Design a protein around this ligand. Structure first.
Ligand SMILES: Nc1nc2c(ncn2[C@@H]2O[C@H](COP(=O)(O)OP(=O)(O)OP(=O)(O)O)[C@@H](O)[C@H]2O)c(=O)[nH]1
Ligand SMILES: Nc1ncnc2c1ncn2[C@@H]1O[C@H](COP(=O)(O)OP(=O)(O)CP(=O)(O)O)[C@@H](O)[C@H]1O
Ligand SMILES: Nc1nc2c(ncn2[C@@H]2O[C@H](COP(=O)(O)OP(=O)(O)O)[C@@H](O)[C@H]2O)c(=O)[nH]1
Ligand SMILES: [Ca+2]
Ligand SMILES: [Ca+2]
Ligand SMILES: [Ca+2]
Ligand SMILES: [Mg+2]
Ligand SMILES: [Mg+2]
Ligand SMILES: [Mg+2]
Lengths: 54, 438, 352, 425
């Protein structure tokens, strides 16, 4: 039950108590993911209009 | 002094952000017009509150915050609310139509067309920072914007601010305050693409906030205002160290250092007490030992789970009010001899304690009663994995039938991103079991 | 209309409970994976406790205490008694036991030999028994070499404890036995002892000079009915009930089952369960737990009661399935889910 | 400003649509001339969802009236609120559709569809942000069925990413104008499977039985059937017309009600339904017991024959929201054998403080039930009873159609039935 690193100031204090010791994707790669999903949307919509055109 | 920029995404983040900045102002003595009489340095200063508030020559104290929603209704409240004068227009960003609770819609379809805008507005706040620490991102798991757009924003922040820290306050989905059936999908999609981009995440289960409001506040049908006023008390306790003089958790880095020895396991459990109903004429003021003991009761945890059946990796006690170190260690001693507190063998069995003499501020007319002392315990327990298990199980039930999956595929998402996200959660639950179970 | 699920088809006990529940016309059974339920008769292994108590407007009750395995595991119980100050290492009603991991894997090997050498030098009886939870696989021996070598040949943790060389023998027969007591703990953590116990007796005369033939040393109902040739001779199914056993203690020993044995049993049950209450209690939990336990005791020639093991999924004596199972619906289920005596249990009052 | 464009087509479409605007115009304080005269701001909060604002604080519905004959629309223009509809939004021909799906879809209808789409485009261009469209029509006639579905196909081509919603009256031999209604309905139901996000199935038989048995109406009339449709339409749209966060925005509703793209045909329900003991107060339990009762459901399907994929309930009036949750969570927890267990929390509830005219409180039921297949089964059987003999086909082959197109519509609906069947097990 040890207290360590006691720091006190005008608005409070902070300390530590030890009971027992122990025993990314680049900007380019994000635009590609975004544009890839935008392309599949454009493809899916293209098949819808082709369906409607028929 | 190093600055912290807050980012609120979606309806949950924006309404929760509102409650926090209302509370922050009452705490630092900032009036709705932005004026702060106590600040004797007009239009400048590197005080502790300057980490969250910038200043103008006119003496206005402006939050370092950005509000982002794909629909204008929620953010319009801020523009005409009590604290409309705190922010300037650039800080509030709104779209025309929302993500319809569709992760793929917020991350891809709509997100792609507004992502760089949030970044530009953020850059503007960063340009006022002489030493930016990082970001605090508030969002929900279940919303289309909260889930979808947030994960895209985190990916870009890691690119545009590599060395900066990023913390989350995330709303875990709760059927009692939700009408969306697909929130499990969204929650798991956003956790998979955000995991490697967040250094510390404080999950708040709406189920827990809901029950605390009914049990302790005697609210029969808690509203969002009730849920947010209480969530901002917990958030205030967690961010207080960054806004007040102190030596514990003085920068966002210290949160990872003191609470996250393993990077993927960065979801500390929060526990707050006391929550007292203001309608009570007068309440027997609780002691340091009693409120500390309450930190180990499931009834006031931000996520309902049983820490008795997990292993702690870290533990911070954040006291506010009439509390001296002598009382703290006395209660801790007793709690150890009665409570089941099992730490991981590769982490010390100890507690970092922070005391702020200013007791919790209560919003006038709010639901919480003024108390002489309160505490928030931040403990990284393997028990919080119970929340991942519940959510992953709901995901499996629907995904096994591919129910609702066509909505996500139709917005440009590939079906394989579902199982890719799910296998990552399977790996997250395994990490918790390897660390906690024998 | 209450609802419940069944996730352990192999439970003869709760099979009857589910049979009685449906007979009440006020309980409806649901599929094993339907989350909207009031009562879960859960599986034995890996019961998903973390998914309980998260259904809006449903008080959920499960038939297993999370964490009670610490008491119902051979090695776990030994660790619990030696490390729990409430039980202490000097516990007088639990045989001197040690945890021994096979050498192919803390461990108490050297600690076991130390006490073993002490007995060998002191002319004292030095007969130990090795067993584990992965058995039907038990070995009784007086040589430490055989005991340790037997465990190394296996691959699971084992426990070596003192073999009771002076067990109380029934007459006529000169035969060993054990006592099974069923204990039901409810959501409020009341400890109820079933007024009906059973003696699982050996139909073979106890022989202290041959631990090789384990038919007269192991009173398991399956061993007696398989390797014992006098099965059912003295009592039906090698099962004596409290009424008979009590009359015997009076005629033979001039005492009662209550004074000589039952007080110690009730004290042991209290001590064991009260010890772990802070760890498994569901008093302030988002769901509620109850569980049925099967304690097994030994009695020596001095009428001292020794605890053998605790069973988490115990079976019942055929003659007592109806009385007990209904008793489970009364104090465990209907106590939280009431329906629109002279209790068959004995309340063991204690300080929570 | 999430505006919705309303379209009503044909005799049935325009008569039901009229009563609808009559009902909600009252709930929002709009009088027959478009002048607001309410007493609550909640009336005008989301007024722009269905109404345009004109000069002099005038509110003009965003509705387009379509028919191939003048008769019905002439009545609307002389009806109670006829003066509130934009004059230019009346688009109509003179030939008629002769209850012929082919005439509405390929010949007569085709000659008039472009002019209708000119008005849609005009109303859309004025929308700050268009949520989508809602169409009212029957499936058993010619205009609302044949041309109605022709309009959806074209509206979807020009607005591919907007929500398409319909209130579709389904024909029944018990309430029938002509024997070819099953032909027209089977042709439309395939259009809807492809081109609508949400379709509220409204069986005229259920409406009739409700009027005869429950409402105790000796001789029902279309007017009586339309009172039920008016109230139901007002109920299911309450989420949209008032301040709320549940089911608001057509796409969010579709995202939480449609687990599979083709299984988007809903069963509506309303409570109360009292016969003139009409002043008695109705308790929350009663509202819930009835709203879920089959005799209050307007699809003519027994829910206990299938399973609910999702359910959306709307309670209106000043009541105990705590008590609402309790009774809803009681129906579910008392009949969970009828809710699919692979969609957690598939029953959602919303409360609204403004009640319908003359009711302390009411409840509207919106269920995506697999029991709806019973409805498509009826139509399918009635269809094949005639088509196997090619009876009455000459009306359609004479307008340019081929028998092959009938065989396909047949197979397309029998497929839709098998789809509902596999998700019921
Ligand atoms: N605690 C709390 N939870 C909220 C609040 N607002 C919404 N939620 C929760 O957030 C989830 C829904 O996500 P939203 O935040 O509304 O969605 P969004 O981020 O606005 O994205 P959209 O789908 O485009 O609307 C549900 O689980 C709600 O319970 C709030 O103000 N406080
Ligand atoms: N230390 C000891 N002294 C004397 N007998 C012992 C003993 N340990 C075990 N036994 C004998 O072994 C039997 C019980 O074995 P144990 O309970 O450990 O195995 P098990 O769990 O597979 C049987 P059950 O669980 O049904 O009681 C008893 O009949 C008892 O006579
Ligand atoms: N509920 C209801 N159904 C109607 C009404 N008028 C016609 N119907 C039904 O609609 C079908 C006839 O379609 P109708 O609208 O008259 O054809 P259209 O004018 O060419 O589109 C028949 O099944 C009628 O039962 C009405 O006012 N209300
Ligand atoms: Ca200053
Ligand atoms: Ca990073
Ligand atoms: Ca012509
Ligand atoms: Mg939103
Ligand atoms: Mg056993
Ligand atoms: Mg007609």
């Amino acid at each position: 039950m040890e207290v360590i690193e006691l720091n006190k100031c005008t608005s409070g204090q902070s300390f530590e108590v030890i009971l027992k010791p122990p025993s990314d994707p680049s900007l380019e790669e994000i635009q590609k993911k975004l544009e890839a999903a935008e392309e599949r949307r454009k493809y899916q919509e293209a098949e819808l209009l082709k369906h409607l055109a028929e | 002094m190093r600055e912290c920029i807050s980012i609120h995404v979606g309806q949950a983040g924006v309404q929760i952000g509102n409650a926090c900045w209302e509370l922050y102002c009452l705490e630092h003595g900032i009036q709705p017009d932005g004026q702060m009489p106590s600040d004797k340095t007009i239009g400048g200063g590197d005080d502790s509150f300057n980490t969250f508030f910038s200043e103008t020559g006119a003496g206005k104290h402006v939050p370092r915050a950005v509000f982002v929603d794909l629909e204008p209704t929620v953010i319009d409240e801020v523009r005409t609310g009590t604290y409309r004068q705190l922010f300037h227009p650039e800080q509030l960003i709104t779209g025309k139509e929302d993500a319809a609770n569709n992760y793929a819609r917020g991350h891809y379809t709509i997100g792609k067309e507004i992502i760089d805008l949030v970044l530009d507005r953020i850059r503007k706040l960063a340009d006022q920072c002489t030493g930016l620490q990082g970001f605090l991102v508030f969002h929900s798991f279940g919303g289309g914007t909260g889930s979808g757009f947030t994960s895209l924003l985190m990916e870009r922040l890691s690119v545009d601010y590599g060395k900066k820290s990023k913390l989350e306050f995330s709303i875990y989905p709760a059927p009692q305050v939700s009408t969306a059936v697909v929130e499990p999908y969204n929650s798991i999609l956003t956790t998979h693409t955000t995991l490697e981009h967040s250094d510390c995440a404080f999950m708040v289960d709406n189920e827990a906030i809901y029950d605390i409001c009914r049990r302790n506040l005697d609210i029969e049908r808690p509203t969002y205002t009730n849920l947010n006023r209480l969530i901002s008390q917990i958030v205030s306790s967690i961010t207080a160290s960054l806004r007040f003089d102190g030596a514990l958790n003085v920068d966002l880095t210290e949160f990872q250092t003191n609470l996250v020895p393993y990077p993927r396991i960065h979801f500390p459990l929060a526990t707050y007490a006391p929550v007292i109903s203001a309608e009570k004429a007068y309440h027997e003021q609780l002691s340091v030992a009693e409120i500390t003991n309450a930190c180990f009761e499931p009834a006031n945890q931000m996520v309902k789970c049983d820490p008795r059946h997990g292993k702690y990796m870290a533990c911070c006690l954040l006291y506010r009010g009439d509390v001296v170190p002598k009382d703290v260690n006395a209660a801790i001693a007793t709690i150890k001899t009665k409570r089941s507190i099992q730490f991981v063998d590769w982490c010390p069995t100890g507690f970092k304690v922070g005391i702020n003499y200013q007791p919790p501020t209560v919003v006038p007319g709010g639901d919480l009663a003024k108390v002489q002392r309160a505490v928030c315990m931040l403990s990284n327990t393997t028990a919080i994995a119970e929340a991942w298990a519940r959510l992953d199980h709901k995901f499996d039930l629907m995904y096994a039938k591919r129910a609702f999956v066509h909505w996500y595929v139709g917005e440009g998402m590939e079906e394989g991103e579902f199982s890719e996200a799910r296998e990552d959660m399977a790996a997250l639950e395994k990490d918790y079991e390897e660390v906690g179970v024998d | 209309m209450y609802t419940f699920v069944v996730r352990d088809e192999n439970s003869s006990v709760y099979a009857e409970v589910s049979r009685l529940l449906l007979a009440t016309g006020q309980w409806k059974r649901l599929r094993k994976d339907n989350p909207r339920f009031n009562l879960m008769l859960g599986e034995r292994n890996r019961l998903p406790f973390g998914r309980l108590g998260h259904e809006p407007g449903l008080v959920q009750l499960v038939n297993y205490y999370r964490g009670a395995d610490k008491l119902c595991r051979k090695a776990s119980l030994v660790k619990l008694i030696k490390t729990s100050p409430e039980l202490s290492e000097s516990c007088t009603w639990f045989p001197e036991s040690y945890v021994i991991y096979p050498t192919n894997l803390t461990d108490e090997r050297e600690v076991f030999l130390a006490a073993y050498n002490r007995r060998r030098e002191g002319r004292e009886g030095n007969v130990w028994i090795a067993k584990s939870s992965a058995g039907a696989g038990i070995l009784i021996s007086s040589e430490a070499s055989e005991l340790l070598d037997f465990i190394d040949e296996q691959g699971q943790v084992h426990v070596i404890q003192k073999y009771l060389e002076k067990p109380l023998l029934l007459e006529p027969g000169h035969r060993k036995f054990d006592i099974r007591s069923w204990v039901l703990v409810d959501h409020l953590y009341n400890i109820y002892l079933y007024r009906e116990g059973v003696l699982r007796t050996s139909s073979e005369p106890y022989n202290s000079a041959n631990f090789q033939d384990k038919t007269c040393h192991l009173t398991n109902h399956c061993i007696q009915k398989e390797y014992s040739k006098n099965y059912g001779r003295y009592e039906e199914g090698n099962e004596m009930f409290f009424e008979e056993f009590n009359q015997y203690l009076m005629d033979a020993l001039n005492t009662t089952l209550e004074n000589s044995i039952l007080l110690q049993i009730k004290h042991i049950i209290r001590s064991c369960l009260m010890c772990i209450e802070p760890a498994i209690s569901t008093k302030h939990l988002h769901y509620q737990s109850f569980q049925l336990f099967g304690f097994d005791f030994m009695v020596d020639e001095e009428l001292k009661v020794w605890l053998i093991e605790v069973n988490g999924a115990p079976a019942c004596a055929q003659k007592l399935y109806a009385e007990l199972c209904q008793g489970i619906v009364d104090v465990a289920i209907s106590s939280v889910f009431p329906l629109a005596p002279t209790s068959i249990f004995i309340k063991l009052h204690h300080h929570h | 400003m999430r505006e919705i464009v309303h379209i009503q087509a044909g005799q049935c479409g325009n008569q039901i649509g009229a009563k609808f605007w009559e009902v909600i115009s009252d709930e929002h304080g709009i009088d027959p001339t478009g002048s607001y005269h309410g007493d609550s701001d909640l009336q005008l909060e989301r007024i722009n969802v269905y109404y345009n604002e004109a000069t002099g604080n005038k509110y003009v519905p965003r509705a387009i009236l379509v028919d191939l004959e003048p008769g019905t629309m002439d009545s609307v223009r002389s009806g109670p609120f006829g003066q509130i509809f934009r004059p230019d939004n009346f688009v109509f021909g003179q030939s008629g559709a002769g209850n012929n799906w082919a005439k509405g879809h390929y010949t007569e209808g085709a000659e008039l569809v472009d002019s209708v789409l000119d008005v849609v485009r005009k109303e859309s261009e004025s929308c700050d942000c268009l949520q989508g469209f809602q169409l009212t029509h029957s499936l058993g006639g010619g205009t609302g069925s044949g041309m109605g579905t022709l309009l959806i196909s074209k509206i979807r081509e020009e607005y591919p990413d907007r929500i398409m919603n319909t209130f579709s009256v389904m024909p029944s031999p018990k309430v029938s104008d002509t024997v070819v209604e099953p032909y027209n309905a089977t042709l439309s139901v395939h259009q809807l499977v492809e081109n609508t996000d949400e379709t509220y199935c409204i069986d005229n038989e259920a409406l009739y039985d409700i009027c005869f048995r429950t409402l105790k109406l000796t001789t029902p009339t279309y007017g009586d059937l339309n009172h039920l449709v008016s109230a139901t339409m007002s109920g299911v749209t309450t989420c949209l017309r008032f301040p709320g966060q549940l089911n608001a925005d057509l796409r969010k509703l579709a995202v939480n009600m449609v687990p599979f793209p083709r299984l988007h045909f809903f069963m509506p329900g309303f409570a109360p339904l009292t016969s003139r003991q009409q002043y008695r107060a109705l308790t929350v339990p009663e509202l819930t017991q009835q709203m879920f009762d089959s005799k209050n459901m307007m699809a003519a399907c027994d829910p206990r024959h299938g399973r609910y994929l999702t359910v959306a309930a709307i309670f209106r009036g000043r009541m105990s929201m705590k008590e609402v949750d309790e009774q809803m969570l009681n129906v579910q927890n008392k009949n969970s054998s009828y809710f699919v267990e692979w969609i957690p929390n598939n029953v959602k509830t919303a409360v609204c403080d403004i009640p319908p005219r003359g009711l302390k409180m009411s409840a509207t039921f919106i269920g995506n039930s697999t029991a709806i297949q019973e409805l498509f089964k009826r139509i399918s059987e009635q269809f094949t009873a005639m088509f196997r003999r090619k009876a009455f086909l000459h009306w359609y082959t004479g307008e340019g159609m081929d028998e092959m197109e009938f065989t396909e519509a047949e197979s397309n609906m029998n497929d839709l039935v098998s789809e509902y069947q596999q998700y019921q097990d």
